[PDB]
Design a protein around this ligand. Structure first.
Ligand SMILES: *[C@@H]1O[C@H](CO)[C@@H](O[C@@H]2O[C@H](CO)[C@@H](O[C@@H]3O[C@H](CO[C@H]4O[C@H](CO[C@H]5O[C@H](CO)[C@@H](O)[C@H](O)[C@@H]5O[C@H]5O[C@H](CO)[C@@H](O)[C@H](O)[C@@H]5O)[C@@H](O)[C@H](O[C@H]5O[C@H](CO)[C@@H](O)[C@H](O)[C@@H]5O)[C@@H]4O)[C@@H](O)[C@H](O[C@H]4O[C@H](CO)[C@@H](O)[C@H](O)[C@@H]4O[C@H]4O[C@H](CO)[C@@H](O)[C@H](O)[C@@H]4O[C@H]4O[C@H](CO)[C@@H](O)[C@H](O)[C@@H]4O)[C@@H]3O)[C@H](O)[C@H]2NC(C)=O)[C@H](O)[C@H]1NC(C)=O
Ligand SMILES: *[C@@H]1O[C@H](CO)[C@@H](O[C@@H]2O[C@H](CO)[C@@H](O[C@@H]3O[C@H](CO[C@H]4O[C@H](CO)[C@@H](O)[C@H](O[C@H]5O[C@H](CO)[C@@H](O)[C@H](O)[C@@H]5O)[C@@H]4O)[C@@H](O)[C@H](O[C@H]4O[C@H](CO)[C@@H](O)[C@H](O)[C@@H]4O)[C@@H]3O)[C@H](O)[C@H]2NC(C)=O)[C@H](O)[C@H]1NC(C)=O
Ligand SMILES: *[C@@H]1O[C@H](CO)[C@@H](O[C@@H]2O[C@H](CO)[C@@H](O[C@@H]3O[C@H](CO[C@H]4O[C@H](CO)[C@@H](O)[C@H](O)[C@@H]4O)[C@@H](O)[C@H](O[C@H]4O[C@H](CO)[C@@H](O)[C@H](O)[C@@H]4O)[C@@H]3O)[C@H](O)[C@H]2NC(C)=O)[C@H](O)[C@H]1NC(C)=O
Ligand SMILES: *[C@@H]1O[C@H](CO)[C@@H](O[C@@H]2O[C@H](CO)[C@@H](O[C@@H]3O[C@H](CO)[C@@H](O)[C@H](O[C@H]4O[C@H](CO)[C@@H](O)[C@H](O)[C@@H]4O)[C@@H]3O)[C@H](O)[C@H]2NC(C)=O)[C@H](O)[C@H]1NC(C)=O
Ligand SMILES: *[C@@H]1O[C@H](CO)[C@@H](O)[C@H](O[C@@H]2O[C@H](CO)[C@@H](O)[C@H](O)[C@H]2NC(C)=O)[C@H]1NC(C)=O
Ligand SMILES: *[C@@H]1O[C@H](CO)[C@@H](O[C@@H]2O[C@H](CO)[C@@H](O)[C@H](O)[C@H]2NC(C)=O)[C@H](O)[C@H]1NC(C)=O
Ligand SMILES: *[C@@H]1O[C@H](CO)[C@@H](O[C@@H]2O[C@H](CO)[C@@H](O)[C@H](O)[C@H]2NC(C)=O)[C@H](O)[C@H]1NC(C)=O
Ligand SMILES: *[C@@H]1O[C@H](CO)[C@@H](O[C@@H]2O[C@H](CO)[C@@H](O)[C@H](O)[C@H]2NC(C)=O)[C@H](O)[C@H]1NC(C)=O
Ligand SMILES: *[C@@H]1O[C@H](CO)[C@@H](O[C@@H]2O[C@H](CO)[C@@H](O)[C@H](O)[C@H]2NC(C)=O)[C@H](O)[C@H]1NC(C)=O
Ligand SMILES: *[C@@H]1O[C@H](CO)[C@@H](O[C@@H]2O[C@H](CO)[C@@H](O)[C@H](O)[C@H]2NC(C)=O)[C@H](O)[C@H]1NC(C)=O
Ligand SMILES: *[C@@H]1O[C@H](CO)[C@@H](O)[C@H](O)[C@H]1NC(C)=O
Ligand SMILES: *[C@@H]1O[C@H](CO)[C@@H](O)[C@H](O)[C@H]1NC(C)=O
Ligand SMILES: *[C@@H]1O[C@H](CO)[C@@H](O)[C@H](O)[C@H]1NC(C)=O
Ligand SMILES: *[C@@H]1O[C@H](CO)[C@@H](O)[C@H](O)[C@H]1NC(C)=O
Ligand SMILES: *[C@@H]1O[C@H](CO)[C@@H](O)[C@H](O)[C@H]1NC(C)=O
Ligand SMILES: *[C@@H]1O[C@H](CO)[C@@H](O)[C@H](O)[C@H]1NC(C)=O
Ligand SMILES: *[C@@H]1O[C@H](CO)[C@@H](O)[C@H](O)[C@H]1NC(C)=O
Ligand SMILES: *[C@@H]1O[C@H](CO)[C@@H](O)[C@H](O)[C@H]1NC(C)=O
Ligand SMILES: *[C@@H]1O[C@H](CO)[C@@H](O)[C@H](O)[C@H]1NC(C)=O
Lengths: 430, 219, 211, 100, 129, 128
């Protein structure tokens, strides 16, 4: 005969959905990493031998929590900064003089308030063509008939830094270490950790930057791959560099909408008039895109696949809409999707609406000219269209949650069920 | 290698067409750019225009409404025309060989360059005067010497307009020739001199009036 | 008439600046315009010189945007004394159709020269045309600052004098002429005529008499 | 060299016994005994392992006994039966043939 | 020997290494606004929340302060008729948790009902002289 | 608790060799060993050898430690407790008395003293 016996602390876990917190390394920043608890010095990797666990990168909640964290992280940091609402005055934009007639920036003058309803000033600025819309000459900001506009503080740095995502006690996160895991399904060589690795929040389009590289062979991940309306994330087994620059020596005017509200506009270009651009190695891209074409052919009955630019997306979808050392770039990617280097024509906009929100309008202060960013293409973001006997893959974006799924694909949260009940021949007393 | 020669009238009444030709020798006209420049008394240099090897012109914005530059590819001759002339257009007109210059500061794909033009081979330039006054041949008189060394001269009295090419013994006598600058008398004419410190012959070529006259000097 | 002067000592090194400062990456041309002569192209590309122009002339290369175009002239001779224009071709100004402001370079510290005066009586055929003109030729003097004074016998004239202005020769010296119109009756009655030229604080007199 | 009980006859509902003994090298005190229901040509089935430990899905109709010199298998309430002797690291030392 | 290392091991092997999971159970596997301060505060409250309710069941049962703990409830064959070595030497704890998942809540009630009677019995036995 | 399937009649002649396939289903392949048992008519049932798909450990019979070798393919998992594996078997020095049905057996337990014991068998594969 047998009797029930209580075992406390048995390796049993349930599902997910808890409250994850932040973690940062040794150290001002934007992502509130000062309030992030210090990341433990050495991590705690330990393999769960004989354990096969079912993952689901597209139904993960760490992404939905991070995507909500990043959105909430921006609004909390935008409150005390200067709002450019009084900057919606009539802009008497003209033009910036060049030497070559074969624009991108305009010279706009306007009135603003100085000391409240008293004397005003007639000051000028240099706004990009994308930041301005004519009302026909006459001009105004692109987002004033939409909703409120506000400027981010220059005292903050929106550059991506490692953000370790931890689970509290009584919970854990599982880590799939199989090199060829296609994002969903079972996985072996599973390990357990308390915090994720150094995940940098990179917001880009069509190209994944500074992400974790794939190992062994190239990896592809999607949902219903037969469904063309579902987005496709591509991993990179060999990285492709990309150096993007803005070769203009901008100036930073400090005009005052007193009291305290000081708006920093673009002063005057000192030097030559050049255009922003992204340098990618054509010999590296033509071979790397050829190896993605190989893995693409494996997921289809030997169907030759074509690449083409975007369809009808906005400026943030049809172009590699990423961010460098301050300014926001929009590189026309019709060249890569059709032995030396390739160069893209990148535009710059200052008043953007990130995450495609209603009510949001940020202003990126001008950087003091000659900005250079060294990046690393570690992924892609493709879509498909329709349903003849060839396949066309176009770059897409839209939802920024896919950016966080590309790094949180191998993580799922699990709680702990320490209670263990099992029978063994063991009794007690009266 | 390349030689130039500005063959012009020398004096044209106001409100007329100004003909002027510049002949080349060792250089072809369908290969390089050619620019005309004028320099006014009391003013600076006025770049007028230029023509390309493709025979296309571009004029200075101040006088774009007048200047017309042509090309005669039969010979090496190139000409210009300037209508509605006034007393302010009288100056020295130069002929120069212009070279194209591409200054690239960025990448050629996004443009980021500009074309600058420089002239390295110039001409002597011809004199042009604008006045309703007529032309007059000069009066040549011989300045006789008198008794270390000595010197004799050749007076040129009352002509219009500038200039007058002066020679001695028809280019033979070279050293010692000292042709002085003329003077604008109150009557409105110029009068220069020439002195040289076997007989001597004074050579006065007055092309604006075509009057060539030769005279000798002997006490 | 907008010309800006500049005085540089003999033997020293000149530093001719350029007006209308560069707006971006620029390619300048330096022209040496001698007064009433043909301009000579010294510099066509900031630092490049055609064959025949010595090393003494040089500009400033537009390497890093910040410098300014200057034409340095080392070992200044008396022949380098002329006008200097600065053609400005940059990346922010369009077709620069006009040359720069003329820099009137003047070389200081040159050896002075005493003039060589020559007085000519009226020509033989001139009196046959009932017109007489006294010609006083002054050459090889520096600086160009001579005042001519005509004297009939002992009394001055200055009645009908038509004097030129000092023009520079090919010898780096100046030369001027002085004319005086006479009637064959006026020149014949006076005992003698004189052409007094007062250069610096000295005066030289040349005399002619009807014989 | 592992001897069994030759051939055993049975009725309906009674209990028969099958033996499984041998030398001191493969039997019996220091070994584990297992039995199998094996029709020659079909896939066999495990009946009892580790002396008298029953196999999953086996009725209490079966049981096992193990002395210091032999091990026994008894049915209660067809085809052939075999026995094996084994430790924890080696293999199976099969017996002979015994039909019931 | 680490956290959850024997998750795929047999229950007999995992029963020997159950102190590691109970050790690092309140501490991890080793005053600002609501951005991170309030989110991590409510996060660590869930840590002790998931901990006390498991320590609560050990309290009402006769297991308060024990890792292994025997009782007096007989094992019902309706829960599982599996061999004693097919459980401890052939089955993992999560694979075993699924078979009883239907009958998990019944044993919990039966564990505390049996122990309360054990209490009232020891109370009656200590009332003597 | 699963299902093991082998290959069909693969009859050659003496001196040759052959490989019998054996695929698994319904259970974790690396959790239990794979045994091999033949039954020649002249002899009796004779156990051959077992191998662990988890550590690659081998244990053969002394009579078959010369002409017998067996391999195991790694796991192709499906769920947390089920997977698909494979384990074949080759023998050399074949004769006319190595003829009989060959079985692919699954291990009994995962721990204890009776873990490698043949529990789940297959449909049987004849040989010459
Ligand atoms: C991403 O990818 C992007 C695209 O791939 C990439 O963009 C690149 O950006 C860089 C910016 O740094 C660009 O670099 C510039 O290039 C300009 C062009 O240079 C090329 O051409 C010249 C000249 O060639 C003509 O002239 C010579 C005579 O000198 C002839 O012999 C030639 O045949 C030719 O002339 C014929 O051909 C023309 C058409 O081609 C015809 O139109 C013409 O009529 C004739 O028929 C070469 O000399 C250049 O370099 C060569 O030599 C070097 C070794 O010295 C080699 O390394 C090289 O490979 C070549 O072999 C090159 O081929 C440059 O003019 C420019 O540099 C000037 O400008 C900058 C900014 O304005 C200045 O700061 C700099 O100092 C330079 O100024 C000098 O030159 C000007 C004009 O001559 C002078 O006015 C000035 O005073 C100064 O003079 C000094 O020059 C020398 C010392 O430096 C020396 O002579 C003296 O000492 C003097 O003082 C600049 O380098 C590059 O072009 C872009 N790429 C492309 C494809 O366009 C980007 O970088 C990538 N990365 C990122 C992060 O984005
Ligand atoms: C993950 O999952 C795998 C597979 O399910 C687990 O591996 C199994 O582990 C159990 C126990 O740990 C094993 O049972 C034992 O089997 C040995 C037999 O091996 C001995 O004999 C071999 C033949 O001569 C010899 O090659 C062996 O040498 C090595 O063997 C293994 C390599 O796998 C290694 O671990 C050894 O240390 C040797 O280096 C070895 O000599 C048997 O001896 C054992 O019996 C003893 O222990 C039991 C208690 O377990 C006791 O009751 C006995 O009386 C005796 O004292 C025991 O039966 C099993 O064979 C493994 N393989 C399977 C099941 O396929 C692994 O443990 C899991 N790990 C985790 C972390 O979950
Ligand atoms: C994807 O790719 C990379 C990821 O690394 C990013 O590109 C890098 O971005 C960082 C952050 O902007 C750059 O780092 C910067 O370097 C500048 C140069 O530093 C030199 O000079 C200082 C002067 O003292 C030396 O001390 C130093 O050792 C170097 O020699 C610094 O001036 C910058 O410092 C400023 O910011 C930091 C952090 O906010 C402050 O602490 C400083 O006080 C100062 O304000 C800065 O450190 C780096 O140069 C970039 N390139 C490379 C190759 O790393 C991309 O941005 C990233 N994301 C994309 C593309 O979206
Ligand atoms: C965008 O537009 C604004 C105005 O709408 C413009 O600001 C103007 O900039 C110019 C410089 O380019 C300023 O003009 C200068 O003012 C100073 C003040 O004294 C003068 O000294 C300057 O004169 C010098 O330069 C002249 C150049 O030809 C010479 O001719 C002269 O002799 C002097 O050397 C010069 O006139 C002007 O005052 C401002 N105006 C305002 C209202 O700010 C700005 O430059 C434009 N930006 C771009 C990139 O085009
Ligand atoms: C786990 O990692 C192993 C590494 O050997 C890898 O083989 C598994 O993927 C399987 O590889 C097989 C090749 O031996 C292949 O035939 C099989 O289709 C493939 N299965 C899957 C699901 O990719 C890796 N498994 C997983 C689930 O990532
Ligand atoms: C805000 O104003 C913009 C002006 O650009 C509106 O957008 C344009 O609307 C007109 C008229 O409907 C269209 O013809 C253009 O194609 C639109 N262009 C763009 C870029 O949107 C916009 O609809 C206005 N929004 C609100 C809320 O008033
Ligand atoms: C870009 O423009 C700035 C001016 O806005 C330049 O900064 C100047 O640098 C020089 C030398 O380093 C200093 O003497 C000046 O005082 C600086 N100006 C100011 C306003 O600080 C800078 O050099 C320019 N850079 C390039 C590459 O053109
Ligand atoms: C982007 O910039 C990086 C560095 O800024 C370049 O990396 C170079 O890689 C080559 C490898 O063949 C090295 O030999 C060089 O030394 C690296 N550069 C430096 C500065 O160390 C990379 O090639 C650039 N890519 C493009 C497309 O421009
Ligand atoms: C990026 O640049 C390419 C050309 O370099 C653009 O492609 C052209 O698009 C127009 C339609 O707007 C077509 O009529 C042309 O035929 C295209 N050219 C080529 C070569 O395909 C493209 O539109 C640009 N991207 C964006 C977003 O404007
Ligand atoms: C972009 O990718 C390259 C290649 O992976 C990185 O280059 C490595 O940089 C690290 C330092 O961060 C060095 O220790 C390695 O030796 C470099 N390897 C190679 C092959 O160059 C580069 O650092 C990445 N860019 C950034 C900004 O980190
Ligand atoms: C804009 O400015 C220009 C001169 O800078 C002026 O002539 C024009 O009238 C202005 N336009 C308006 C609408 O004020
Ligand atoms: C406001 O703008 C108008 C025309 O745009 C101008 O006349 C007026 O001076 C400006 N206000 C001030 C305070 O300068
Ligand atoms: C499992 O992951 C660990 C991570 O360090 C690695 O060392 C090990 O080789 C991996 N095992 C397999 C079978 O891939
Ligand atoms: C990923 O692999 C699993 C293997 O079980 C398969 O079921 C699933 O359909 C795959 N998904 C994609 C997007 O390839
Ligand atoms: C994928 O899309 C197809 C439509 O072609 C649909 O029939 C199928 O059910 C979808 N798969 C899933 C898992 O929803
Ligand atoms: C990346 O994938 C290709 C296959 O297209 C392979 O040949 C290459 O070796 C992989 N990269 C590395 C570093 O192994
Ligand atoms: C400007 O950027 C270029 C491109 O990297 C670099 O070579 C140069 O040194 C930079 N100059 C300054 C002053 O930062
Ligand atoms: C076992 O559980 C059943 C519930 O189906 C119940 O009827 C029976 O009385 C229980 N027996 C014991 C001994 O607990
Ligand atoms: C639990 O009970 C439900 C309902 O009777 C049944 O469908 C399910 O299979 C049972 N699960 C187990 C593991 O006994």
């Amino acid at each position: 005969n047998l009797w029930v016996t209580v075992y406390y602390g048995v390796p049993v876990w349930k599902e997910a959905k808890t409250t994850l917190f932040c973690a940062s390394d040794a150290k001002h920043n934007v992502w509130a990493t000062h309030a992030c608890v210090p990341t433990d010095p050495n991590p705690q990797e330990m393999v769960l031998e004989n354990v096969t666990e079912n993952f689901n990168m597209w139904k993960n909640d760490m992404v939905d929590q991070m995507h909500e964290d990043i959105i909430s992280l921006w609004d909390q940091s935008l409150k005390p900064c200067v709002k450019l609402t009084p900057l919606c005055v009539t802009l008497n934009c003209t033009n910036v003089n060049v030497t070559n007639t074969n624009e991108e920036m305009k010279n706009c003058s306007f009135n603003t308030t100085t000391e409240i309803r008293d004397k005003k000033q007639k000051e000028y600025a240099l706004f990009y063509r994308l930041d301005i819309v004519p009302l026909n000459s006459e001009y105004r900001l692109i987002n004033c008939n939409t909703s409120t506009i506000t400027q981010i503080c220059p005292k903050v740095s929106f550059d991506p830094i490692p953000i370790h995502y931890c689970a509290p006690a009584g919970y854990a996160i599982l880590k799939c270490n199989n090199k060829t895991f296609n994002g969903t399904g079972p996985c072996n060589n599973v390990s357990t950790v308390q915090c994720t690795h150094g995940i940098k929040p990179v917001v880009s389009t069509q190209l994944l930057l500074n992400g974790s590289l794939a190992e062994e062979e190239i990896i592809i991940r999607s949902e219903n791959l037969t469904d063309n309306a579902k987005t496709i994330i591509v991993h990179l087994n060999e990285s492709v560099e990309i150096n993007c620059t803005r070769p203009n020596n901008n100036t930073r005017k400090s005009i005052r909408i007193g009291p305290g509200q000081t708006f920093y506009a673009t002063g005057d270009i000192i030097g030559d008039i050049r255009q922003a651009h992204c340098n990618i190695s054509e010999a590296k891209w033509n071979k790397t895109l050829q190896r993605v074409k190989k893995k693409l052919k494996e997921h289809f009955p030997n169907k030759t696949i074509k690449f083409a630019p975007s369809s009808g997306g906005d400026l943030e979808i049809t172009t590699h809409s990423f961010n460098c050392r301050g300014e926001f770039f929009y590189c026309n990617t019709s060249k890569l999707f059709n032995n030396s280097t390739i160069t893209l024509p990148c535009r710059i906009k200052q008043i953007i609406n990130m995450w495609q929100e209603v009510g949001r309008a940020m202003y990126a202060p001008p950087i003091a000219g000659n900005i250079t960013c060294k990046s690393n293409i570690t992924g892609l973001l493709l879509t498909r269209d329709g349903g003849n006997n060839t396949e066309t893959f176009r770059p897409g974006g839209g939802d920024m949650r896919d950016n966080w799924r590309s790094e949180l694909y191998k993580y799922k949260v699990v709680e702990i069920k320490p209670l263990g009940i099992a029978p063994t021949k063991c009794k007690r007393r009266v | 290698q390349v030689q130039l020669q500005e063959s012009g009238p020398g004096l044209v009444k106001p409100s007329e067409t100004l003909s002027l030709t510049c002949t080349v020798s060792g250089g072809s006209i369908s290969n390089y750019y050619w620019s005309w420049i004028r320099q006014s008394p009391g003013k600076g240099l006025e770049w007028i225009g230029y023509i390309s090897d493709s025979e296309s012109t571009n004029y200075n914005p101040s006088l774009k409404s007048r200047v017309i530059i042509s090309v005669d590819t039969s010979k090496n001759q190139l000409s210009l025309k300037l209508n509605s002339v006034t007393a302010a257009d009288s100056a020295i007109y130069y002929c120069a060989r212009a070279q194209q210059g591409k200054r690239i500061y960025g990448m050629v794909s996004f443009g980021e360059f500009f074309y600058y033009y420089y002239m390295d081979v110039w001409g002597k330039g011809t004199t042009v005067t604008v006045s309703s006054a007529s032309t007059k041949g000069p009066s040549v008189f011989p300045l006789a010497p008198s008794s270390g060394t000595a010197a004799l001269g050749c007076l040129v009295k009352d002509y219009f307009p500038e200039p007058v090419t002066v020679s001695w013994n028809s280019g033979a006598l070279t050293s010692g020739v000292h042709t002085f600058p003329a003077v604008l008398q109150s009557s409105g004419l110029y009068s220069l001199s020439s002195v040289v410190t076997q007989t001597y012959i004074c050579n006065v070529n007055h092309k604006p009036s075509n009057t060539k006259v030769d005279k000798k000097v002997e006490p | 008439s907008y010309v800006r002067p500049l005085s540089v000592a003999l033997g020293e090194t000149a530093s001719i600046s350029c007006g209308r400062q560069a707006l971006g990456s620029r390619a300048v041309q330096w022209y040496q315009h001698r007064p009433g002569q043909a301009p000579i192209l010294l510099i066509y590309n900031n630092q490049d010189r055609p064959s025949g122009i010595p090393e003494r002339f040089s500009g400033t290369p537009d390497i890093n945007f910040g410098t300014r175009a200057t034409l340095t002239i080392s070992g200044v001779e008396a022949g380098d004394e002329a006008d200097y224009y600065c053609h400005m071709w940059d990346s922010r100004s369009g077709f620069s159709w006009s040359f720069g402001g003329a820099t009137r370079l003047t070389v200081l510290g040159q050896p002075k020269a005493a003039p060589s005066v020559t007085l000519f009586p009226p020509s033989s055929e001139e009196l046959q045309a009932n017109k007489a003109t006294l010609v006083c030729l002054i050459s090889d003097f520096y600086p160009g600052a001579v005042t001519v004074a005509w004297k009939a016998d002992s009394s001055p004239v200055k009645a009908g004098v038509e004097t030129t202005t000092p023009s520079k020769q090919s010898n780096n010296k100046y030369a001027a002429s002085s004319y005086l119109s006479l009637t064959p009756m006026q020149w014949k009655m006076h005992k003698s005529y004189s052409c007094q030229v007062t250069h610096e604080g000295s005066t030289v007199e040349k005399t002619v008499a009807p014989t | 060299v592992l001897t069994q009980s030759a051939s055993v006859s049975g009725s309906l509902g009674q209990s028969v016994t099958i033996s499984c003994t041998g030398p001191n090298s493969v039997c019996c005190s220091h070994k584990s005994i297992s039995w199998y229901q094996w029709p020659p040509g079909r896939a066999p089935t495990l009946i009892i392992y580790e002396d008298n430990e029953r196999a999953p899905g086996i009725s209490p109709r079966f049981s096992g006994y193990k002395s210091y010199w032999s091990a026994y298998l008894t049915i209660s309430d067809e085809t052939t039966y075999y026995c094996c002797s084994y430790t924890h690291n080696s293999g199976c030392v099969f017996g002979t043939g015994t039909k019931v | 020997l680490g956290f959850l290392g024997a998750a795929g091991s047999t229950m007999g092997a995992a029963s020997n290494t159950l102190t590691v999971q109970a050790r690092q159970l309140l501490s991890g596997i080793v005053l600002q606004l609501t951005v991170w301060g309030f989110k991590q505060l409510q996060a660590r409250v869930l840590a002790i929340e998931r901990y006390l309710e498991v320590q609560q069941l050990l309290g009402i049962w006769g297991c308060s302060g024990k890792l292994i703990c025997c009782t007096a409830v007989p094992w019902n064959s309706s829960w599982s008729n599996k061999s004693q070595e097919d459980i401890w030497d052939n089955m993992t704890w999560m694979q075993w948790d699924r078979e009883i998942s239907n009958y998990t809540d019944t044993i919990y009630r039966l564990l505390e009902e049996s122990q309360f009677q054990q209490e009232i019995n020891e109370k009656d036995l200590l009332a003597l002289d | 608790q699963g299902q093991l399937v082998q290959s069909g009649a693969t009859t050659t002649k003496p001196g040759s060799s052959v490989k019998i396939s054996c695929k698994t289903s319904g259970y974790r392949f690396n959790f239990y060993h794979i045994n091999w048992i033949r039954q020649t008519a002249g002899r009796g049932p004779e156990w051959m050898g077992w191998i662990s798909p988890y550590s690659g450990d081998k244990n053969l019979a002394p009579a078959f430690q010369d002409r017998v070798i067996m391999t195991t393919d790694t796991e192709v998992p499906v769920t947390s407790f089920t997977s698909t594996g494979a384990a074949y078997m080759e023998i050399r020095n074949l004769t006319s008395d190595d003829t009989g049905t060959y079985f692919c057996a699954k291990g009994l337990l995962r721990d204890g003293s009776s873990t490698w014991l043949p529990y789940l068998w297959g449909q049987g594969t004849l040989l010459t």
